[PDB]
C-alpha cells in the first residue's frame, strides 16, 4: 500500500513539537486506497508504511525521504496514489511532489557548518558539519533515540535545508555522527 502522512514536526511558532494528525486503524485503510483527505501543513511530515514510521521533508516542490523507509511506494494524496518523482536506491532516496497544504524549505546557500537535525520527537539537536555527507553530534546519543528520524532535514542557522538524514555512525550503540544526503545531491537528482 501507499505511504501515509500521519502527522508533522512543527517549527511554525516558537517551539519544536510533533503533531500526530492520524490514528493507526485509519492508516492501514488510506494505505489501501491512497486517497488522503486529511489536512497537511508545513515542511516536515511524519509518514508511515504498514511496518515503519519515519520523516519526510519538502524542499522546493518535492517531498523527500529515504528509500529504506518508503521502498517503491506511492504516497496518499487527496486525488489518489502519487507516484515517486525520483527513486535512487544507491543514495537511499525517494522524491514525490510536495503534498497539498504543505510549505517547502529553502535550500541552504550560506555554507555554514553549524547545523541542526530534527528528530521525530521534536528535538532539534546541534550538529557540526564534518564534510560532504556527514556531521558530528555535539552530544552523542544512543541510536534508539534517533530511529524513526530518517527523512528529517538538517537545518542551518537560518532555516534552510542542508540535507536529509540517512544513517547514524555508531560504535558501542552510541551515535556521535550522522549521514545525510546533502541538498547539492538532491537537485543533481532532479
Ligand atoms: C538513527 C537511525 C538512522 C536514521 C536511520 N537510518 C538507518 O537506520 C539506516 C538504514 C540502514 C541502516 N541505517 C543506519 O543508520 C545504520 C544503523 C546501524 C542502523 C545505525 N548505520 C550505518 O549503516 O552506518 C554506516 C555508516 C553508514 C554507511 C551508510 C549506510 C547506508 C544507508 C542506508 N542506505 C540504504 C539504501 C537502500 C536501502 O534499501 C532498503 C537500505 C539502506 N539502508 C541504509 O542503512 C533511521 O532512523 N531509520 S528508520 O527511520 O528507523 C527506518 C524506518 C525507516
Ligand atoms: Zn544556510
Author numbering: 990 to 1179
How is this structure described in the published paper?
The HCV NS3/4A protease – a chymotrypsin-like serine protease – is a prime therapeutic target that cleaves four known sites along the virally encoded polyprotein. The NS3/4A protease also hydrolyzes two human proteins, TRIF and MAVS, which are part of the innate immune system, thereby confounding the innate immune response to viral infection. To elucidate the underlying mechanism by which chemically diverse inhibitors bind to the wild-type protease and drug-resistant variants, crystal structures were determined for 16 inhibitor-protease complexes. These complexes include wild-type protease and resistant variants R155K, D168A and A156T each bound to telaprevir, danoprevir, vaniprevir and MK-5172, with resolutions ranging from 1.10–2.50 Å; S139A protease variants were used except for telaprevir, which requires covalent bond formation with the serine 139 for efficient binding.
Telaprevir potency was slightly better against D168A relative to the wild type, while danoprevir, vaniprevir and MK-5172 lost 100- to 1000-fold potency against D168A. Unlike in the danoprevir and vaniprevir complexes with wild type, in the MK-5172-wild-type complex the P2 quinoxaline moiety did not stack on R155 and interacted less with D168 and the electrostatic network involving these residues. Thus, the single-site mutations R155K and D168A only caused very subtle changes in the MK-5172 binding conformations. Overall, analysis of the four crystal structures explains MK-5172's significantly retained potency against R155K and D168A as well as its loss of potency against the A156T variant due to the rigidity of the macrocycle. Unlike other inhibitors, MK5172 does not directly interact with R155 and D168, which mutate to confer multi-drug resistance.
